[PDB]
Structure formats: C-alpha cells, structure tokens
Amino acid sequence: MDKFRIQGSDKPLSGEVTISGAKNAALPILFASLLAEEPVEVANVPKLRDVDTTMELLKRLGAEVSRNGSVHIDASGVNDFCAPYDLVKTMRASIWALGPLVARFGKGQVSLPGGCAIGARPVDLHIHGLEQLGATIKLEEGYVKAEVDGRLKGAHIVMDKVSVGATITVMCAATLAEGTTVLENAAREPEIVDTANFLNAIGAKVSGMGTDTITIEGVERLGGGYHEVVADRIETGTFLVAAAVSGGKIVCKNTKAHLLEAVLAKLEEAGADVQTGDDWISLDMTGRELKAVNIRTAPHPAFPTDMQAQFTLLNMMAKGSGIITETIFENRFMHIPELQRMGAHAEIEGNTAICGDTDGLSGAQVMATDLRASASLVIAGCIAKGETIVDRIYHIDRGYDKIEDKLTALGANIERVHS
C-alpha cells in the first residue's frame, strides 16, 4: 500500500506540465478495439493502472496487446467472452466489454458492478440499450449475460437519462448492427467525441457525436487504424486548480481550452488570469485574490463532476462561502471529512456542500477513497503547514500518470513511499 508523503509549503506551485491523454477516452477506445479485426494503434495513452487492467482484460479475451507511447491491439484472435468478477471489482469500466463482444461475436458476459460510495451507479441504461439493439440479457450468478442470434439490429433509442457510459455502450455496439441507430439524449462529453472519432478511424460510420443525437450506420466488420487520444481535460483542470489555490502560475501543454470552458470560466470567476493558445492553457494567480464560486455539476459542457472535489478545495481556501451542488453523484463528498481533518471548513447538506473559510490547512494523515478525492488531498498536502500523509494512493494511479513527478516539476515536495 503506497502512500504519498508531502511536505507542505506556502510557496506557489509554478512552472509547466505536459498533459496526458484522457483516461476517460483511452478506456472506452481500448474496449472499442474489441470490434477491430485488423491491427490498431492508439497513441497518447496515459500510463495508469486502469489502462493496465484494460490491457489485461483485452489479453484475457484473446487480443494481442503491448504498450508504450501508443497501445497496440490485435483483436483478430479474440476467443473468450467473459469479464470476470475479479476484474470488474477492480474497475467498473470493464462493463464496456459487453457491447463489443455481443455485437461482434453474438455473446458476452460481464460481472454486474457492486456498490460505489459516491452514489447509486446502476447499468440499467447499458442493458436496456443493448436489448433495444436485439440482445437478450439475463442476470445469472451476478453476471450480466447477453446473447444475440446473428447480428444486432439498428434501432431508435431514446435514453431515459444522460449517461456517458451507456452512450459509449450503445454507440460502439451499434457500429456492427445491421442498418441505422439513432441514439437520442446522448452524452456530449469530449471522450464520446473521441471514441466516435476512433470508431470512424477503424471503418465505422458515426455522426452527431458532441450533440444530443448520435447516428450510427452499421457495417459488417471493422478494420484497424490509428488514433491519438484527446488530452485529459480533468488532469488539465486539476493542475490549473493547483496553481490557483497556491497563488502560482502554470502552463499546461498539449491540452485545449475547448474541452473545459466551464472550468476556465469558473477559474476566472475565482479571480485567476487564464490565457490559452493553440494547444496550451495557462493560469496566473500571482498578486491576485482567490474568491469563492458557486458550482453546479451537470453533463458536458457544464462543470464536470470530475472537477468537483478539486473545486471544493479551491472554495475552502478562497475568501467567501462557495456552494457546490452535485447533480451527478449525489454522495461524492468523501474528500470533505478528510479535508476537515486538515482544518478545512464546510457543511454538507444533502447533495450540496457549502464551503466556508479557513485560515489555512494543517498536515494530517488522510485517506484516498476515489480518484478525484485523492487528487484534491494531494494538492491540499502541497499547500498545508507541515507533513500530510495520503494513504491508499493506488486510487490516484488509476486516474493520473505519475502525478507526483508533475507536481515535483512545479516545486512540490512529495515522496511516493512503499510498505
């Protein structure tokens, strides 16, 4: 059990970071490569334990996989169709294997994900999406088992609710169905756009991505090809917040402002000087007062739930109260009790956190529990007085490529410690 040991400072975090490819685009694209009959190259793939878990599932199902800068997949030989209980419990994104397997091979099993602390996370929309495409699905011994006789069939699918995951499941599966799929009330996240762009690079016909209505005209087989994953907008946001809450200046390279306009506008609302270029974003906080903002999480292009913990920290440190309402995962406030151990002030009322003022943080032992809660704990440790120990940081390594190297380059004192 790795830990982060952090020596806090009042010196601003400043300098440059180079942004990695989006975890949340890399993962679905890797599962979508289960559709592909010829070799695939996915470039700009972050080095994350979820990418490792994905590669290990891909290999288990029969694809030949290897990596470094790119990930290389030869899925021609896929010859197994189960995502085991052990693998799904380590990462629920493995649910994405169900769609391509059933659409390509007419059969697939994926363990049904268990409980998650951040809120109810059912997969009813994924199942119902596949049923509308012609799948027969049953639950048996904790397994979602899907079958179709022959090919899936294009259907008009109106999603009950906006879901990123379920959008990816029906979109990817629709690429191999006979005829046309119209997916209505689709999620508009950039990683949906990136996956659809990847499906097109491999021979699919997906249009409307980035809109509330995606059109997929199915083909018999997908080929292979090349695709460079979009930059991680949430890693981008995270470093920009690091700069803002510490009063520093940072340039995030290999990223793009169009992926996080909501976060950028709020960082300006919070008093930061945000500038952008062709593939960079900079924030300057030097000589500027941090003011609290109100935030309401919602689907893209609104402010992202994946930035909410990071902005709870910002508001906590900023002058003023700041109200954060979570409409996506109504219980994603596990970082708050940990931050309160460091002397942060906030009240939690239902799905609303009201962030107070504090004079400053004070290092303590705190525990990572989910990806973004962790990142906010690491950042707080960098700005607290004294030594913070963040335990169970394997959570962070699921979602960030060597965050401690990138923070070190911005002037942080952070050590990865083993046991």
Ligand SMILES: CC(=O)N[C@H]1[C@@H](OP(=O)(O)OP(=O)(O)OC[C@H]2O[C@@H](n3ccc(=O)[nH]c3=O)[C@H](O)[C@@H]2O)O[C@H](CO)[C@@H](O)[C@@H]1O
């Ligand atoms: C691996 C990955 O890409 N994960 C991201 C993805 O997760 P994920 O794809 O699970 O998130 P969804 O957009 O599907 O979920 C949004 C809401 O819809 C609900 N829901 C979802 C599916 C379903 O079948 N039924 C249902 O009720 C969920 O409980 C949640 O409250 O989008 C989230 C919202 O931006 C991000 O926080 C995650 O980092």
Ligand SMILES: *[C@H](C)[C@H](O)P(=O)(O)O
């Ligand atoms: C729900 C279970 C959370 O996302 P995880 O960090 O446990 O995967």
